[PDB]
């Protein structure tokens with residue numbers, strides 16, 4: 091039911107310093123649950139050091155106008171483009187307002203990255219079992235379209251970009267300061 095997609099392949103030789111820097115916006119997303127129709131905006135600031143990823147996450151529920159903040163931490167796989175994180179909930183100033191629930195995790199795979207674009211996949215789990223998954227197209231610019239290389243990657247696993255929700259058309263509110271100040 092909440093089974094995560096197969097054939098999610100980590101990019102070979104992802105440039106760590108480039109990917110794990112700055113702020114990424116989700117320009118297009120595809121939630122593999124067809125009934126997940128609430129509109130969201132998302133941005134994050136992933137960082138890596140000594141084999142451990144530490145990232146700040148920002149969601150904005152467009153339906154409800156409520157934003158939420160998390161931080162995630164986990165080991166980067168030897169392949170250098172996949173990681174499984176545990177997450178807490180923080181407030182806008184970075185202070186923990188709810189501890190990590192040990193029964194939850196998520197696994198990020200960076201499928202492709204090109205110029206200012208990337209394609210990632212996220213598998214959400216509870217007690218090590220799949221509970222849902224989503225593909226996201228990332229860009230450094232919220233208003234930009236993906237590089238063709240990102241399209242090729244989508245096409246390799248029989249996904250088409252037209253199926254994705256386009257976020258630039260939504261009434262997104264972003265907390266950019268939360269992400270830009272991450273680990274400063």
Ligand code: HEM
Pocket residue numbers: 116118119121128129130131132134147149160162177179196198212224226
């Ligand atoms: C635009 C793309 C995305 C959409 C539409 C989306 C959608 C959602 C939704 C609907 C929820 C549940 C919210 C609720 O319980 O009210 C959620 C939760 C969550 N998502 Fe996302 N997501 C996106 C991207 C991501 C990414 C890229 C990551 C990881 C890097 C991520 C990690 C999480 C985490 C950690 C939660 C925690 C839920 C909780 O605290 O209960 N999401 N997302």
